Each structure stands twice: as structure tokens, then as C-alpha cells.
Amino acid sequence: QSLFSLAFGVGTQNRQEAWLEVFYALPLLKPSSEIVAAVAPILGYAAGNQALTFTSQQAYQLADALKGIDAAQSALLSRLAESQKPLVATLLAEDAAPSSTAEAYLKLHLLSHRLVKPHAVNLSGIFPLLPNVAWTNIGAVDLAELAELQLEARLKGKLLEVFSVDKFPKMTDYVVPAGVRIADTARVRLGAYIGEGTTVMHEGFVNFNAGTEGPGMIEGRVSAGVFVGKGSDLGGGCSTMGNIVISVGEGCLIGANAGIGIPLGDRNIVEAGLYITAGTKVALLDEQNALVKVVKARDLAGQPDLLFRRNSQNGAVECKT
Amino acid sequence: QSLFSLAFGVGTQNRQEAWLEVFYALPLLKPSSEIVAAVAPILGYAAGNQALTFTSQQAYQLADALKGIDAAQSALLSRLAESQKPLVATLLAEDAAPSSTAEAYLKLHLLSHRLVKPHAVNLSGIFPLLPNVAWTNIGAVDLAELAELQLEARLKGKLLEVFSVDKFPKMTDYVVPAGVRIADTARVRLGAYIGEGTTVMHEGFVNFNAGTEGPGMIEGRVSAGVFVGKGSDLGGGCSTMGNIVISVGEGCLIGANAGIGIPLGDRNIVEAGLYITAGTKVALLDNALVKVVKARDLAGQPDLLFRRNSQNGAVECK
Amino acid sequence: QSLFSLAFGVGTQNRQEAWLEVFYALPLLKPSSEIVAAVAPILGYAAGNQALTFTSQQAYQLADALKGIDAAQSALLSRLAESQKPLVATLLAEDAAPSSTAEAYLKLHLLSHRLVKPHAVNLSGIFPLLPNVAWTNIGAVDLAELAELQLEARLKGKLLEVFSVDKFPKMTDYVVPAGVRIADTARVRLGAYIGEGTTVMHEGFVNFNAGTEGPGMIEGRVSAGVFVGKGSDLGGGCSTMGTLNIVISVGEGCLIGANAGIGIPLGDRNIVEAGLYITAGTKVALLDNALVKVVKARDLAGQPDLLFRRNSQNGAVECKT
Ligand SMILES: N[C@@H](CCCCC(=O)O)C(=O)O
Ligand SMILES: N[C@@H](CCCCC(=O)O)C(=O)O
């Protein structure tokens, strides 16, 4: 059969041979049967979704097999052959709920390389597969081995920098997609989809399985599962919640410190400082500003050309057209 | 007498021999008289609260004394003997307002190692004892020596990374306690108390003498002096203020971009986007209006829900 | 004529010889004609605003010329002569809209060194002159060369740290002015003016051409073009709007509340209540606490001793005196 994805990885492991993270230089969506046919016998792949650890020798073998079939992947495998760290090939026959750390990391790569979009890939039960880990300037480190490494650094008059303790690394450790700006890279997780023409500013944040079509200006918080359409601006310190999935249309404008608990349609505007939820009672208004009726926000969810605000004289939530 | 605390430190110093910071690998709350008796004569400790700089030779001596008494401390001292940087032993006979940089750092360590909880230790006049400093990837640097170090890095085609200019370093430089998650480590100061099962997210922040019982999900700002009870969630960009001390009960839920200027009881809920202060007039409900009272008078009571009327903008409390 | 500014720079370049950034150890506002007269012939400077790349040999020459005239600059040039990276002298005859990357960086330095204040310098068309770049712990790197560098790091079991993808580096890479505190240095761009006695906390942010007279406590977002007067406090996650109409400024002795926001310039000693966003078109209730009249905030912009709160009971936006 035709595989969903395949990628050759270099990773890091703790003393107990558990995998902490994998790096994939060139992950492949829907690889050709030519590549699979040449690779399967050397790895010992028959079927299904596998994380197959291969040796330095197999690297060279694989590298050789793919000459004539795919040069880029061949070249990569020759570099992988030389490496100091362990190697792993992950072949995914179907888009299915992951079952290894190596598969977990592949899927996150696909998102962030833009090969797929949010919600187009299965991520069920991914948390238990991502081990909590110390992200230091010398790489991934196991939390049980941390203190000792911290002590040796200090005894040499040095410091081991620890920038995150988490189950998700930051994206720019693995990839930086084209035509994008990220002010502070700590605030974008691997799995984020950052679209072409997007600026993610310092106060901006983008979680996994989330992001922007592009172009766009993100100064606020894009939660996991949320996708923002082309041309929309998210103002400083604005929020999206983490039932319904929240999404944001094309050409929208969310104000600074505002927040949305419902999916917005195309060309919507939320006023600065305004938090609107699904159960919020809103005052709907016409061409002139006249009260049509009182509905809840969820009933106006997904609709275009809305303008939400809060009356400065009387504290009423309004929604104009 | 029985000492309050003791710890053996390796630190950094500027050209003028002033101390910028101290690292304590294994700080001790209420150390046994056995340890003290073996250590005091070699250091020259008689009484009170002292920051005693000891030499590489004394390290070995101390190391040897403690064999049979306490192995872990003995082993540590042998490593300390080899070190490149200066050493300091700080012995605290009482829990009292600090009088040296070294003692200042010890107390912060106790908090962050979870040996003590917020408000259970004296931190009066700590600011003037903590010198403002450049925190770089090669360690602590004095601000007056910074530019020169910056210039040499650049001339070699390199960059000296400067991640903070502050009187408090970030916690994970010194310790990372067990069963915790910190998305961005820049946002947790040394002195923070991060309880087991807590996740501090990117937008989360925890100052010194503050933190969480654990478990909990912190996506907001926990100010100095504030302690959050077990099971509570603090939403994205929510605030606690920096009179009354603010605290947060068990099982609470603070909404995104909300804010609390009063202590919340167990199982309280503050709605998203809502800022409630001590002088805020609130509408108490049974959802029939019972009366109108000030938020300070509702302080510390359980099972509340603070929200605002979307039709008329009235602050309520069902 | 008398020059506006001059500075000798060490920078970094990509493979195509385009300049990614410049570092200026000691930039000079209004340098004396003595310094100019000694430097101009060796560099080939006649007139106008020039970015002149000079060689390691010229460095020594320049270094020698300035002995007796200016020791500090002489000393610096002798160190620059030894350097591994390329050198550039930027001489600015007038305060004018920039025309090179090197001039762009010089002007940012002047702000951040405090030699000039926000709005006192021409920054028109600066964006296209600042190339988007990967800021890593080994320096500036071109985005087109990134992936390869990332790969080599990983093959050696290491990690290349990438802390920002942006057209502006963070300030503390170039300077840290005296008597200041910056909790998180990622949140202050080069060009920011941080005044003496200021504390910029973790949630605080200061963009280019922006900042504080000093002293002050900044726990919120100071947008580009915004200047905050002496003694003011900006509370946690508070906002100021962007010019990118009126320029927003903040007076002396003001107090902005946590999560609040200002879309108008505040006068001296103004107070904005926590959680309150006030814009130019916001209808406000002016008070004496008896209602005097109802005006639009823009009519109260730049005036002192106000108190903008929000009535808890009926949500009316008030302004007491
Ligand atoms: N409910 C929120 C916050 C949880 C993120 C924590 C995590 O994924 O580690 C959201 O969906 O963003
Ligand atoms: N709205 C913010 C930042 C705009 C984007 C910054 C940039 O593009 O460099 C301000 O005006 O301060």
C-alpha cells in the first residue's frame, strides 16, 4: 500500500534508553512507493505504523539504495551514518492515533513544516507519549540527570542554561518555515502552523495543532486546536479559549486584551478589553444602531460582518451591522 | 543551640570582592547538632547568623570531619574543594531578617527546594542585599564589567547572551523541584514555591515568596506574597495584586484576563475578563438579589461565583 | 559642516555580502570637526550620509590618526583592526530618513544609548532596511542558511538555540544603560529608551522608538512611538495602542491598572482603573461625584489629575476629579 508518511530521524535518549526527542531534517508526506520498496527490506518493515531504530551501518545501506530514486534523502542518510547520536526511521502506513514518541514527533514536524494543516492529522493520546524533559543549551536532558549536570557546570565556573521544562519543545529548535517572523521563539511550540506572511510578536503565543493561514499579525494567545484565517489581526494580550472548537475567519480584528469563546466569521471585529463567551447575552443591532433583539453569542457564531463592543454609558454588550 | 538552617555554597564575585550570587547544591533545614558540632570549630562559628567564607583547604577538612556523620554533605564538600570559584558557609541560628547576600540566597533556596512555604520565613529588607546584576550564558556578570565583555565577544565574531538584568535570578538556574512543568523558565524567580503536579505555562509568572500547593495550572501572574491552594486553575493573563495579603483557596477557577484584589475562598469562580477589587460594589445573589456588599466583606468565603451582567454591566456574586 | 553622528562598527554578513546587523561599541552624537577631519580622507568621505566599509588596514590607520584627538575612539579602532568580522564606518551629515542597514542600526543605538529621545530622530522607511534574520546563540544567521546549521548541530548531539526570528534584535545584545532593571531581556527591542530608575518586569514590553523618562515600573506593553513620563507605573498586562491619528504618550506620576488599556494620551498624575480599556471615541461621564456632562475621551486627552474608573453597579465609564 501507499504510506501516509515516512522520515529518518536523529534523536536523544536517557540512560534507560527511553527516547526524549527526535529531529527530522526532511520529513515526507505520502512518500512514493519507490522510496518505500527500497527501504523496507533493510529496516525490516512489513506493515502498519512502526518506529524502527536502525544502526549506523544500515544508514549507509539505506543511503546507497536510494541513489537514483531520491537524491536529497540519500544525501541526508550519508550524514546520518556519521552521527554521534542514535537513529530512528518512522514509517506511518495510515493517519492514526500515535503509539510511539518517534511517531509523535513526526506528526508535529508535518504540522510545522506546513505539510499538513491543523485538524488534518490524528493526535489522540499524544500527551503520555511526550516525556517531560529539561530543554537546555546542550540539548534535551532527563530531569533525573539534571542536578548532577547543573553541579558540574557550576564547579567549572560556568552555567547550564535551562530554558524550558516541558513535554513540548519550542518549534524553532526543529524548523523555521519561510516568510515568517517570530519575535520570541519560546512562545511557539513544535506542532504550530505558522503561515506565510505572519508576524508572531513577543506577547503572541501559538500552541500545538494551532496557528495561522497567513498573512497575519499575532500579538495574542492562539490556543491548541485554534486556526486563524488569512489577513486577521490578533491584538496584544487577546485570548482564545481551550464543546466547540474555536476558529477565526478571514480579515478579522481582535482588540488588545479582548477574548473569544466562540468561532468568529469572516471580517468580524471584537473591541479592545471585551471578553465574549458562548453564553454571553448580546444586543443585536441594525444598519442604524437600533436594537433588533437580544440573542446569545453562540447563535451568532460563524457569521460575517459582526462588530462586538461594550456600551460605555450602560455596560451592555452590543453587536452591530 | 539547634540551628535554623545551614548550607555550603559556591558563588561568584566581582573585581571588588562583593558577592553577586551563591549556589547551594544541598541546603539543610534544621540541621542536626552533630553536623554543627563537627563544622563550627573549623569555620570559626560561635553564634548567631553568619556568612563565613572558607578556603579550598577548609573544604577538605570539613569534608573529612563529616564522614560517619553525614555522607551526602561530605561528598559535596570534596567536590567543592576542587572548585574554580570562591566558597561560603552560611549558618543561621534563628529565622531572622537577613544581613548578608549569602543568607538572602539561602532563604530563597529553602523556598524553592520546598523545605519551607511562603510566609514561613523572614525576608524583611532583602532587596538592598540582592545586587542588580547581568545574568549571561557565561554566568553572573557585574554591570560595570559588562560592556567590555560584550566587546570582546563581538570582536571574536561571537555574541554574549544576556537574558536578564535583575536583583533576582530565575529559579531553574539553581533548582527544578520534582513533578513540575515550567514552559518558559524566565518567568519563575528563585524563591518561588512550585508544588507537585503544577504546570506553569508560557503566560504564567511566579515571583519570590509565592507559588502553589500543587497540583495546578498557572497561565497567569502570581505576585510576591501570594499562595495558591491545591487544585486551583489560573487562566491566561489573569492577575493577582501586589493592606491585605492575597491568597487563593482549593479548587478555584480564575478566568482568562480576569483579576483578583481580594483573597478567594475554597471553590471560588471568577469569570473571564472580570477584575474585582476590595472596594468593588458587588451584587450578592441566592438568582435573586439579596443585597449589595463590598468585595472585601466577601473575602475568604467558599463557593462564590464572580461575574458581570452582559446586559447592564453589573458586578454580581451568585 | 558639523556632522549629526558617526560610529565605527563591527557587523555580520551572509554569503551574498548583504549586512544582517552591526554592533557599535561607542556611538557619537554630534562628533567634533577634529574627529571628522582626521577620519574623512582615509575613509573617502566627502559629504552626505554614508555607510563606508573599511578594511583591517584602514582600522590601524584610523586608530593612529585619532591619537591626541580622541583616545577612547583610537583604542577601539586598534581592537577593531584585529577582528574576525567585517567593519563599517557610518557618518551621518544630517538627521534624515535612513538609506542603509548600517545607518538604521546606528540610529537605534543612539536611542538605546540614551543619546537621543523618542521622536527626536528620523526613522522613516526603516523596515525594508532591516532584514529578517535568525537570532541564535552563535550570532545572527541568514534564514536560507539556517536549516543546514541546525542539522550539523544535531549530528554532533548538540542544539543550535534560536531565540528570535525578526527584523529587530533585542537591546541587551548591544547595550544595557545604567541604573535599569530588565526581568526578561527578550521583551525590549534595540531602539528602546529605558530611563534611569526604570524596572521592566517579565510581562513588560518596550518596542523601538519608545520607552521611559525614568524612574518607573513597567509590567505592561509600551508600543512603538510611545513615551512614558517620570514616576509613572504601568500595571501587569496593561496596553498602549500602536500608530502602525494620534500619538499616545503618558505623563508624569500616572498609574495604569493591571489589564487596563489607553487609546489616548494621558496627562500628568492620571489614573486608569484595572480592567478598563479607554479609547478616543469612548463616551465618558465627567464628574466633579456629581455628573457634570458626558464627553468623548479624546476631549480629555493631555489633561491632568483625572481618574478614569468604571462604575461597577451600572457599567458607566466615569472620570472623576
Ligand atoms: N486549555 C488551554 C490551556 C492548556 C494548554 C496546556 C498544554 O497543552 O500543555 C488550551 O487549550 O490552550
Ligand atoms: N502594534 C504594535 C507592534 C506592531 C508590530 C511591530 C513590528 O511590526 O515591528 C505597536 O505599534 O507598538
Author numbering:
A (entry chain C): 3 to 244, 251 to 329
B (entry chain B): 3 to 244, 251 to 294, 297 to 328
C (entry chain A): 3 to 246, 251 to 294, 297 to 329
What does the paper say about this structure?
Pseudomonas aeruginosa is an opportunistic pathogen that causes persistent infections in humans. Randomized transposon mutagenesis screens had indicated several genes from the diaminopimelate (DAP) biosynthetic pathway to lysine in P. aeruginosa as essential, suggesting the corresponding gene products as potential targets for new antibacterial drugs. Dihydrodipicolinate synthase (DapA) catalyzes the first committed step of the DAP pathway, the condensation of L-aspartate-semialdehyde and pyruvate to 4-hydroxy-2,3,4,5-tetrahydro-L,L-dipicolinic acid, which is non-enzymatically dehydrated to yield L-2,3-diydrodipicolinate. Tetrahydrodipicolinate N-succinyltransferase (DapD) catalyses the transfer of the succinyl moiety of succinyl-CoA to the α-amino group of tetrahydrodipicolinate, the first committed step in the succinylase branch of the DAP biosynthesis pathway present in most Gram-negative bacteria and mycobacteria.
